[PDB]
Design a protein that fits this description.
part of a larger assembly; 7 chains; A alpha+beta (101); B mainly alpha (119); C alpha+beta (65); D alpha+beta (119); E alpha/beta (220); F alpha+beta (128); G alpha+beta (226); A: 101 residues; two-stranded antiparallel ribbon; 2 helices; 4 strands; D: 119 residues; alpha+beta; 4-stranded antiparallel beta sheet; binds potassium ion; binds magnesium ion; binds zinc ion; RNA-binding; ribosome
RNA sequence: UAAACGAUGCCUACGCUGUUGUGGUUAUGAGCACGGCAGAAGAGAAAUCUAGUAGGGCUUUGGGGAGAGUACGCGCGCAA
């Protein structure tokens, strides 16, 4: 029986879409189906900022950040616990997740 | 693993709802009240009840328990609710109101002292 | 007899089984706007009630009168 | 209120070749009408064929655990011989509370709490 | 035209101060007939006064039709709108329910203390959904106060009014109380007792009542 | 394109179910007029107005509380006077009431008039 | 040995006092929520027939738990019929349960004539259809003296309802006895409520009898109290 | 040749509400074409709804599992 109204993907009014590759296992997954995750990570860890304050030559310094978008296939997303199995009424709830660091 | 339980809690709430005028902060007072007001045969049960009554009393006193009815508090509440403020917004004859409302007033020729809200 | 009840808004019979059917009664205004002993009476089916349509329909008919 | 009488009413009806269902239903009515606050009846054996089973019935209140079982509960057991084997019968009855101490205990159960009415 | 007890100027004024006419932003096909324009600044819909008076009169009329007024049941399961019901029912002789409406309490004989209804009244019927649903089992009409955002299947008389403000709740209940009394001849004019009653019904915080107590006692 | 006599029927059937009292019907032909005029003679519909819009045509009609259902038959079968009662028993609910309409050299007539005039024709539609 | 009836509901007060008749009850679409109300008027006349007994099972850790399900009809051979199902550990207990449901769902059934209105009415008035689950039943009027052309289960139902001639057709999985019984009862019921051409003129209006007798009931309120 | 799938033929009808898009036009109130979403009422064995109402027109197509989309003949293809 049909488990989801949208077939588990975001394609509508189209024939075909570009593929992308999974970060964890390099499998091909369609772009409109892949699980997506955003990361904004400081170059320097929080446990070093108190040393940075005496190491730097400049009057003040702003740490550089690094930015990423990651893609996962279903198997990897479930195994890494980005997503979890949910009850028949919960399946319908849609909410934006946090940006990781 | 020292949980009073449903029998003890039901009995305790009935006692505070009816004998609040007789209880105090003290366990030893509260036990003399339950030895009189109730039929509890088991020694272990009357200690559980009197301990539970002291705890309820100090909650009701230090700003309230919901879903617990004390008669003399209903008396206080009614006397407090029986009051009208000095300040009012009903008695001022002038009013300012929205532009659409002025057109509603115009369409029904309503007499009064309406003015456009300056905004 | 058992077969003589008809709905005022939808012009069909009401069956004995319909739990959602209701009868609405209202008094008539007197001279100088007071009350009287005479009653308006309406029999209304459940089908209109499940839809929500009864609100407007009654307002129409009080105007018709 | 005597389980030893009722069990012999049951044993009789087996020899009279009357269905166990009808027999047991009658027994429970007699026990309840006489004022028993509950009872348990079990029949066990080659009751409806070559495969043996037991059928158990419960009505009202029955106590199983602790000292309150020794003062409120009464039991009897009997057996009837038939052409196919022995059928065993168990009856238990819970006595009513009785302020003169004839039909059952004077004092009600140790765990029951009663709160007095106010004047 | 519908035969309605006349509007009087102070009453009209009263409702406008009480902010009865401020609807929400949304609207429903059932309620389009009561709106008369939209605020250009606010997208708020504005309710037609002349229609509000009409359905208020229509409600009053049918409340008068039922003997033994105890059989009228008024329910409103919310603070911020509680005390209104408690006084309103006494002004007409009705019974009331205050807390959570125990589901099954009209259906089931075992639940004590609520009478078999012959007419049910509800305020802000997004809550008290159960009450509207359950009255349907026992052949009772239903009268509700309602707002443009919300819509109901079994409500026979929908009185249109703001239901999301303590100013507003007081105004509806206070006025309707008076009409029912007037229709029976218990009072001689409706403008008699405006600021007294409309204030009594209006909800107030504990924190306000402390201040008012201290003030009153100083004045005494 | 849809058949005009079919369109007429679905338009009034749905509106009746939705408890409306009046409708506008958007494409009209000569036999559609005669069909509506038949329903008026037997008191199934009350008021008829025709709009002469120069684009096909359209009608506005008032429904009575007596109308339960109507329908067109397609194709329009030829029938001898011997055949009509077979169709009567298939379409109508009771022997006591309702109408089966037939086209003939004498206009539209009902299954009783067929006996009076002694004529078959072509089957067109029904209402009850 | 017997227990006296104290009416739990407002309408119950009226029947015991003898202020109402069974046609008035049905005529005003009043609820019935006390079986005793039906006993009061029809106890001397009601027949019943068991349509089906069947065993149902629930799987558990210990094994199958099992119960007896019984479905039956109550009717009077003249005007009234109702259908009821019950489930219990015992076939007797199940019958007691089913009877309550049946009584709380009695209905009056109208009748008519195949042709002209000579003699007594004998068939359903109008051709009608009833549906329940996968099962559909259609009933058609029949000439006087044809008898009941009907299948196993449905035949009993028409007889209890006091119908003398019928033609019947059926579609779907009629082995399911509960569906076949309910569908056929809906078919006759739907025929009684058909919007006959005369109906609009036959219309009458009255005040509801519970509002009409309010004064007496208010006396009864005070009598119970005093 | 494909799970060439929204597993839902093509024209043409009659049909409840709220919300959100894309492109033009606008008495600025709204419309027309192409969509998404959430209820309702009906429907259906249910799950659910491209599935509501209906003798409108025309084509394809199924008739308990297996053997079998296999044998023989024929048509296309360099072969597969
Ligand atoms: K594809
Ligand atoms: K996804
Ligand atoms: K054993
Ligand atoms: K293929
Ligand atoms: K497209
Ligand atoms: K299907
Ligand atoms: K081959
Ligand atoms: Mg699966
Ligand atoms: Mg124990
Ligand atoms: Mg094609
Ligand atoms: Mg096959
Ligand atoms: Zn992967």
């Amino acid at each position: 029986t049909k488990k989801r109204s949208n077939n588990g993907r975001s394609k509508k009014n189209r024939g075909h879409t570009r593929c992308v590759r999974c970060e964890h296992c390099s499998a091909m997954v369609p772009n409109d189906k892949a699980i997506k995750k955003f990361v904004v990570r400081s170059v320097i860890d929080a446990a070093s900022l108190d040393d940075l304050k005496i190491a730097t030559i400049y009057e003040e310094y702003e740490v550089p950040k690094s930015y990423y978008k990651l893609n996962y296939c279903v198997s990897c997303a479930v195994h890494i616990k980005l997503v979890r199995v949910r009850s028949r009424w919960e399946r319908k709830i849609r909410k934006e997740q946090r940006v990781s660091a | 693993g020292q949980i009073k339980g449903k029998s003890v809690r039901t009995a305790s709430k009935v006692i505070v709802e009816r004998y609040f005028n007789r209880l105090t902060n003290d366990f030893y007072d509260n036990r003399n009240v339950v030895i009189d007001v109730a039929e509890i045969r088991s020694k272990k049960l009357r200690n559980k009840v009197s301990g539970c009554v002291t705890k309820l009393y100090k909650r009701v006193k230090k700003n309230g328990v919901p879903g617990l009815y004390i008669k003399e508090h209903e008396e206080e509440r009614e006397k407090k609710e029986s009051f009208i403020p000095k300040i009012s917004i009903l008695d001022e004859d002038k009013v300012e109101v929205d532009e659409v409302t002025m057109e509603m007033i115009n369409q029904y020729e309503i007499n009064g002292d309406y003015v456009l809200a300056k905004k | 007899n058992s077969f003589q009840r008809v709905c005022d808004f939808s012009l069909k019979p009401i069956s004995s089984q319909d739990r959602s059917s209701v009868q609405i009664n209202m008094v008539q205004l007197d001279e100088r706007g007071r009350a009287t002993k005479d009653l308006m009476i309406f029999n209304v089916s459940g089908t209109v009630r499940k839809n929500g349509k009864i609100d407007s329909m009654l307002y129409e008919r009080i105007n018709e009168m | 209120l005597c389980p030893a009488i009722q069990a012999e009413f049951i044993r009789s009806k087996f020899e009279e070749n009357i269905p166990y269902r009808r027999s047991v239903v009658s027994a429970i009515k007699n026990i309840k009408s006489a004022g028993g606050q509950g009872c348990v009846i079990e029949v066990s054996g080659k009751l409806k064929g070559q495969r043996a089973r037991s059928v158990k019935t419960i009505d009202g209140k029955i106590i199983h655990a602790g000292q309150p079982k020794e003062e409120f509960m009464r039991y009897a057991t009997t057996s009837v011989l038939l052409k196919q084997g022995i059928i065993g019968i168990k009856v238990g009855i819970m006595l009513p509370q009785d302020d003169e101490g004839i039909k059952g205990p004077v004092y009600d159960m140790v765990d029951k709490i009663k709160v007095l009415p106010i004047k | 035209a519908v035969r309605v007890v006349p509007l009087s100027d102070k009453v009209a004024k009263a409702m406008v101060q009480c902010c009865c006419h401020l609807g929400g932003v949304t609207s429903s096909t059932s309620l389009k007939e009561y709106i008369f324009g939209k605020r250009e600044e606010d997208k708020v819909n504005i309710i037609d006064i002349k229609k509000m008076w009409e359905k208020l009169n229509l409600a009053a009329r049918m409340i008068c039709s039922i003997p033994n007024p105890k059989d009228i049941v008024v329910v409103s399961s919310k603070d911020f709108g509680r005390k209104a019901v408690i006084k309103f029912a006494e002004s007409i002789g009705a019974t009331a329910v205050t807390g959570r409406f125990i589901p099954g309490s009209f259906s089931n004989y075992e639940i004590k203390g609520v009478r078999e209804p012959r007419l049910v009244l509800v305020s802000d019927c997004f809550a008290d959904k159960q009450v509207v649903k359950e009255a349907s089992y026992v052949n009772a009409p239903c009268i509700a106060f309602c707002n443009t955002d919300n819509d109901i299947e079994f409500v026979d008389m929908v009185i249109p009014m703001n239901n999301r403000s303590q100013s507003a709740i007081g105004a509806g209940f206070c006025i309707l109380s008076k009409l029912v009394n007037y229709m029976k001849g218990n009072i001689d004019k409706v403008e008699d007792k405006l600021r007294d009653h409309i204030e009594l019904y209006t909800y107030r915080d504990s924190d306000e009542l402390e201040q008012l107590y201290q003030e009153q006692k100083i004045e005494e | 394109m849809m058949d005009k006599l079919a369109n007429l029927c679905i338009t009034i059937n749905n509106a009746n179910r939705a408890q409306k009292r009046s409708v506008v019907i958007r494409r009209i032909s000569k036999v559609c007029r005669l069909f509506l005029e038949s329903m008026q003679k037997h008191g199934y519909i009350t008021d008829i107005v025709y709009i002469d819009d120069h684009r096909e045509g359209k009608a506005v009609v008032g429904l009575s509380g007596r109308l339960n259902r109507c329908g067109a038959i397609c194709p329009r079968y030829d029938v001898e006077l011997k055949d009509v009662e077979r169709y009567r028993a298939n379409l109508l609910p009771s022997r006591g009431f309702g109408h089966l309409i037939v086209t003939s050299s004498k206009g539209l007539i009902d299954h009783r008039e067929c006996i009076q005039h002694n004529t078959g024709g072509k089957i067109l539609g029904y209402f009850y | 040995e017997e227990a006296e009836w104290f009416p739990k509901t407002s309408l119950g007060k009226l029947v015991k006092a003898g202020r109402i008749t069974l046609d008035e009850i049905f005529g005003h679409s009043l609820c019935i929520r006390e079986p005793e109300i039906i006993d009061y008027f029809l106890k001397a006349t009601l027949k019943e027939e068991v349509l089906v007994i069947k065993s149902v099972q629930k799987q558990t850790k210990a094994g199958q738990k099992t119960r007896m399900k019984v479905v039956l009809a109550l009717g009077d051979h003249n005007n009234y019929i109702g259908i009821g199902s019950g489930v219990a550990r015992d076939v007797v207990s199940a019958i007691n349960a089913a009877k309550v449901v049946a009584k709380c769902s009695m209905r009056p059934i109208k009748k008519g004539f195949w042709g002209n209105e000579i003699g007594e009415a004998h068939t359903v008035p109008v051709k009608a259809l009833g549906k329940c689950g996968s099962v559909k039943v259609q009933v058609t009027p029949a000439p006087k003296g044809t008898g009941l052309v009907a299948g196993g289960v449905s035949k009993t139902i028409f007889k209890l309802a006091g119908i003398k001639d019928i033609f019947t057709s059926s579609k779907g999985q009629t082995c399911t006895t509960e569906n076949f019984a309910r569908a056929s009862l809906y078919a006759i019921t739907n025929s009684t409520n058909f919007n006959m051409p005369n109906v609009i003129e036959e219309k009458v209006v009255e005040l509801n009898p519970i509002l009409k007798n309010a004064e007496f009931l208010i006396e009864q309120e005070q009598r119970d109290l005093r």
